[PDB]
Amino acid sequence: KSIGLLATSSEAAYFAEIIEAVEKNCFQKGYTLILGNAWNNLEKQRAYLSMMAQKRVDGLLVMCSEYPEPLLAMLEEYRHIPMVVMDFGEAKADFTDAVIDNAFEGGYMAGRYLIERGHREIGVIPGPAGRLAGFMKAMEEAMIKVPESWIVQGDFEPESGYRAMQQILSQPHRPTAVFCGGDIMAMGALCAADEMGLRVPQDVSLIGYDNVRNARYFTPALTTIHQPKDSLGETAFNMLLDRIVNKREEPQSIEVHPRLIERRSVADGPFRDYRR
Amino acid sequence: KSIGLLATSSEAAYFAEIIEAVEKNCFQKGYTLILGNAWNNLEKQRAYLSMMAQKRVDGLLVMCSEYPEPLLAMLEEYRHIPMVVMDFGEAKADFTDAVIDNAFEGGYMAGRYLIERGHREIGVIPGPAGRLAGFMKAMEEAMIKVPESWIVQGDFEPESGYRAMQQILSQPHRPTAVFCGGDIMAMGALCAADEMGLRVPQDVSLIGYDNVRNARYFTPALTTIHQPKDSLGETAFNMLLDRIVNKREEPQSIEVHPRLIERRSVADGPFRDYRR
Ligand SMILES: [Mg+2]
Ligand SMILES: [Mg+2]
Ligand SMILES: [Mg+2]
């Protein structure tokens, strides 16, 4: 029949691939999709909420960065209509289905991979997460110092990755490897390096995060961490139906794990002078 | 307000970029979108239409691959709801709005450019067009002939672009330039060349088609033909808003012209000698 979808940003970096999968599933199961897209404003979501209760939608699905009292209270009134509140992060014992992405585990692997490969002078282009924390613990264990000037934030978009890579690489002393907190951002990092005349991985190694579909088709093929994006969505979908048909009122836990995908963007570092 | 969009295939290559422009404009105004992908089945599209009227949508946006007499017939029974029905085919004396992308002229520009640049040994990776037919004409006019061994189709995805590029490039005799009928496929071609040891455009020149968001961040920066999808979407959506307040109900004609965007993926061919 019909299902609503109250997001924060369909055309967003992190959430992007998830909604798509949701879309393809409805269509597959010949459903009607009522897309809502607020932007962190109690009114708008309030509207998208009531308007959805109006169309007598057969199931609600929420995806929000935050979940404040106002929001959660609102998500309470409309508790007559089935729903799924994807809570990315803090397992708050409220009633929202929290997803465990093991971001920290991912940041750690990237960090460890570079170390094992022989790099000690590393750079980071973070987003605006647990990833950073994990990458930082591996550097801690290895006693690697990370110059502040070697850390530049991006916005998940290519151009931000472009400018961050430029600034890091344009210093008297630069790193031999760089960890990028998002594949799309790495595309921009890859472009800036080449435009500066640097070779990858020859002159600079690089590892991203997410493992988007086109990642294997970058130049060169990008070594990155695979975060199951179009799997977490097919799950929430299935969870929704069950929640309505089998009438499964009880909540669930959507947990996943990262995995390193080795390709051609990383080379041996100067410090392979210890262990084979 | 609520807006309905009935389309054959949302995830379809051509429409995908238009649909996104619409979604974007919707959310910008705080409106809701009800998505229904019919898929050419008179029964489904017909069921979709009925439900949208039930849901009392304020406007209806239609864009299908074809309009059989039966479809137009049902569309007429719901003429009480404001709508925009985009027809990409030949303009007909009916109530539909006509859309002209001028793809033929875009293909022509591509070919002429390659020729202008000094290339005579040219290859092509066509999609599954008017642009392909506009290209060939440019080829005809300069008496150039492209061997069959240098023509390999793709399907718009990166893998087909990759696979086709290596095939063309692995021939005992290869062309100096290649026309890729899609920036996405182009991304795969670019990767293919790299892994085979060749440089673009030192060894091979490459031109795409679309000018997708990320084109400028490909490695190297992609020279391509800008095909305005965003413009179409915007125009269509505004037309619908005009009709909601009963303005310009008569059939309209939406036309766009492609433009050449010179970047860094094309170099001088062995036959240049125009000037400087
Ligand atoms: Mg989308
Ligand atoms: Mg080990
Ligand atoms: Mg004309």
Could you tell me the two tokens for B151? 């023509």
Is A234 in contact with A201 (CB distance < 8 Å)? no
Scanning the structure block, which residue is given the tokens 């490459």?
B206
In chain B, residues with a C-beta closer than 8 Å to the C-beta of A30 are 44
Task: Provide the shortest C-alpha distance from residue B50 to chain A (in Å).
Answer: 12
Intervals of CATH 3.40.50.2300 along chain B: 1-102+227-258, 103-226+259-275
Angle at CA of residue A21, ends A17 and A22, nearest 5°: 115
What is the topology classification, in CATH, of domain B103-226+259-275? Rossmann fold (3.40.50)
- Whether residues A219 and B158 touch (CB distance < 8 A) is answered with no
Is A115 in contact with A269 (CB distance < 8 Å)? no
Is A189 in contact with A159 (CB distance < 8 Å)? no
For chain B, say whether A8 makes contact (Cβ under 8 Å).
no
Q: What is the 3-state secondary structure (H, E, C) of A78-147?
A: CCCCCCCEEEECCCCCCCCCEEECCHHHHHHHHHHHHHHCCCCCEEEECCCCHHHHHHHHHHHHCCCCCC
Nearest CB neighbour to A219, from listed B33, B48, B191: B191
For chain A, say whether B24 makes contact (Cβ under 8 Å).
yes
In chain B, residues with a C-beta closer than 8 Å to the C-beta of A265 are none
Is A15 in contact with A23 (CB distance < 8 Å)? no
- Residues of A forming the annotated binding site? 14, 156, 210
Could you tell me the two tokens for A162? 């472009």
In chain A, residues with a C-beta closer than 8 Å to the C-beta of B24 are 11
Say which amino acid occupies B230.
D
What is the topology classification, in CATH, of domain A1-102+227-258? Rossmann fold (3.40.50)
SS3 A28: helix
User: Alpha-carbon distance B240 to B26, whole Å?
Assistant: 11
Distance B239 CA to ligand 3 centre (A): 20
What are A88's strand-pairing partners? Answer: A99
Q: Strand B97-100's sheet: what is its strand order?
A: A254-255, A98-100, A85-88, A62-63, A2-7, A32-37, B32-37, B2-7, B59-63, B83-87, B97-100, B253-255
Residue of A107, A101, A27, A18 lying closest to A61 (CA atoms):
A18
Helices marked H in chain A: 13-28, 42-54, 69-77, 103-116, 130-141, 158-169, 183-196, 232-244
User: Alpha-carbon distance A220 to A138, whole Å?
Assistant: 26
Distance B74 CA to ligand 1 centre (A): 28
Tell me how many residue pairs between chain A and chain B have CB atoms under 8 A apart: 90
Ramachandran sector of residue A111 (left: φ over 0; alpha: ψ -120 to 50; beta: rest): alpha
User: Alpha-carbon distance B175 to A113, whole Å?
Assistant: 40
Task: Provide the shortest C-alpha distance from residue A167 to chain B (in Å).
Answer: 17
Closest-CA residue of B relative to A57 is: B55
SS3 B84: strand
Is A112 in contact with A261 (CB distance < 8 Å)? no
What is the resolution in angstroms?
Answer: 2.4
Is A57 in contact with A2 (CB distance < 8 Å)? yes
B10-14: Cβ within 8 A, 24+ apart = B10/A23, B10/A27, B10/B35, B10/B37, B11/A23, B11/A24, B13/B127, B13/B156, B13/B182
Q: Strand B177-180's sheet: what is its strand order?
A: B122-125, B177-180, B205-207
Residue of B190, B25, B158, B15 lying closest to B86 (CA atoms):
B15
Say which amino acid occupies B207.
I
List the 155-184 stretch of A: residues with Cβ below 8 A of B.
158-159, 162, 184
Distance A9 CA to ligand 1 centre (A): 10
Residues in chain A: 276
CB atoms within 10 A of CB B259: 14
For chain A, say whether B26 makes contact (Cβ under 8 Å).
yes
What's the distance, CA B267 to chain centroid? 25
CB atoms within 10 A of CB A21: 17
Task: Provide the shortest C-alpha distance from residue B1 to chain A (in Å).
Answer: 9
Distance B258 CA to ligand 3 centre (A): 12
SS3 A43: helix
| DSSP element (H, E) containing B243 | helix B229-244
Task: Provide the shortest C-alpha distance from residue B105 to chain A (in Å).
Answer: 29
Is A71 in contact with A6 (CB distance < 8 Å)? no
Is A80 in contact with A91 (CB distance < 8 Å)? no
Nearest CB neighbour to B217, from listed A162, A213, A217: A162
Angle between helices A13-28 and A232-244 (to 10 degrees): 50
* Residue A250: partners with Cβ closer than 8 Å, 6 or more residues away: none
Nearest CB neighbour to A34, from listed B32, B48, B219: B32
Q: What is the DSSP letter of A150?
A: G
In chain A, residues with a C-beta closer than 8 Å to the C-beta of B219 are 190-191, 194, 218-219
SS3 B119: coil
Angle at CA of residue B35, ends B33 and B38, nearest 5°: 155
Q: Mutation test of the interface with chain B: which of A3, A25, A31, A32, choosing the one with the most B Cβ atoms within 10 A? A: A32
For chain A, say whether B48 makes contact (Cβ under 8 Å).
yes
CA terminus-to-terminus distance, chain A: 59
Is A254 in contact with A236 (CB distance < 8 Å)? yes
List the 200-259 stretch of A: residues with Cβ below 8 A of B.
213-214, 216-221
Is B189 in contact with B164 (CB distance < 8 Å)? yes
Q: How was this structure determined?
A: X-ray
Is A218 in contact with A186 (CB distance < 8 Å)? yes
CA terminus-to-terminus distance, chain B: 57
Could you tell me the two tokens for B192? 């293919």
Nearest CB neighbour to A35, from listed B32, B48, B216: B32
Question: Residue B99 CA: which ligand is closest?
Answer: 3
Is A158 in contact with B217 (CB distance < 8 Å)? yes
Distance A136 CA to ligand 2 centre (A): 18
Ramachandran sector of residue B143 (left: φ over 0; alpha: ψ -120 to 50; beta: rest): left
Q: What is the DSSP letter of B215?
A: G
User: Alpha-carbon distance A172 to B226, whole Å?
Assistant: 39
- Whether residues B34 and A37 touch (CB distance < 8 A) is answered with no
- Residues of B forming the annotated binding site for hypoxanthine? 14, 156, 210
Question: Residue A109 CA: which ligand is closest?
Answer: 2
In chain B, residues with a C-beta closer than 8 Å to the C-beta of A47 are 30
- Whether residues A34 and B30 touch (CB distance < 8 A) is answered with no
Strands A254-255 and B59-63: unpaired
User: Alpha-carbon distance B25 to B31, whole Å?
Assistant: 9
In chain A, residues with a C-beta closer than 8 Å to the C-beta of B214 are 158, 184, 187
Distance A190 CA to ligand 1 centre (A): 26
Q: What is the DSSP letter of A222?
A: P
